[PDB]
Fold:
Amino acid sequence: IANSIDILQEKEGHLDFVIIPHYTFLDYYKHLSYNSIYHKSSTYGKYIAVDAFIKKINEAYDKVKSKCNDIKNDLIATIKKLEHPYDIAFKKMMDEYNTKKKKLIKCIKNHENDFNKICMDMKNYGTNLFEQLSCYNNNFCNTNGIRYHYDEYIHKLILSVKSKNLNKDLSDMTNILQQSELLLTNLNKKMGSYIYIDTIKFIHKEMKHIFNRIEYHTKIINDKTKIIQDKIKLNIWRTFQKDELLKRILDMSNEYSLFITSDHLRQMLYNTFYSKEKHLNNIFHHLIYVLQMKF
Amino acid sequence: EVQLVESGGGVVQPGRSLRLSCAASGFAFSSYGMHWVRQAPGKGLEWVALIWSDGSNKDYADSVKGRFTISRDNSKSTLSLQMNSLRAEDTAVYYCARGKEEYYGSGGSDYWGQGTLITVSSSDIVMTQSPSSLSASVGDRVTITCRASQSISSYLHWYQQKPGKAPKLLIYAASSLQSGVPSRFSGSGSGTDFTLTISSLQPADFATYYCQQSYSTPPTFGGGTKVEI
Structure:
């Protein structure tokens, strides 16, 4: 359902949506599909078919995505008229935006039933893999699936986030939005109404949202970083009862899938944020050009 | 400072219901798993139920299954136990204790509440504590033994239940001294056999003493070791 859909324009000519509870739902079974095959070395040979099934699923889900493409291209088209209002009083094509934006969310909820069929196929596949899990005695279950899988598929993702300063990344994006406001203040003052002073206001505000979506996803990134790093130490280098092992691997597939969601989206949002920052620079220069001319 | 004040206890006609609650103060409640452990009259420590820090997972003792229900409200910092279908076996002092380890409440119990009394008006690992009763004089090196029915690797913790007061943790990993516990107390062991060593018994009469495994699902306790001076 809506309120949980993210818009992404990493490129100038690119726009894609993402249903956050779907990417997390799919990522969750992506983990316990792997955790349930690396548990005992007798079963690693299944990765080829597991990778193969995730590909089949990611294709069926994106066939459903490509149905709304027609409405997508309308909005990509609407934006470009606002981006560079070259060849065009303003709220005329500006309102055409909000309605085509909302016609596409309406389009997704149309196939919301079609997305669930692809989702449960990931759960049904994930389940029949994790249920077949067995130990030699059920009293001493080995944390070898958990150990390998984290070190390989997850550890890298954690390491990268530790290296960067996701708080200076935010603190820098803010300085960009604040100086744009100060200069757009000086420009709307110096000349008054002009269609491009309204495109600067549009993008500036549009970028203010992408920042708030970034500020929020890095907060989940910060929390799931300490938790996954803390929790992991208690689920490896030991043996559990089988009913406790299955429990601990689900708690993991949860921390993972929620961390992976907020990391994957934060990158595309940073991508979109700085993609809109470029457009905002072109306009800014064109205005400075227009202004000095009058003098 | 920490505090787990419990409430909700009293006399109950057999077969009815009663709700028990716990008031958490002094720590990040949201990060800790909680446990309810009872002590029937004169008998030892029987674990009732546990819940994870996020309240997602929660497990019970075999006897109370289908009757009791644990829950927590992280905002108010509240833990509760809804006891239904009360049998005469549920007569006990009910302790609300905090798990040592975050999220899972594994590896023992940091702090304990005083406990609230319930009076009804009518597989799992087995710990075998060696000396049931023991009478020494001041200064004696004292030793108690705990035998586990299954190899539990260093997941052994020792507790000190003074006369009519909430248990207190002394050793967490098989040999790990809790800060504030004097030098004297020491533990050792692995797999199946573990032992606690009170060198130089000090005058604080140490009352009864219980061990606890935390490797498998129901964290089993041994019977006690009453220590007289």
Q: What stands out?
A: Residues 242-294 of chain A form the longest helix (53 residues).
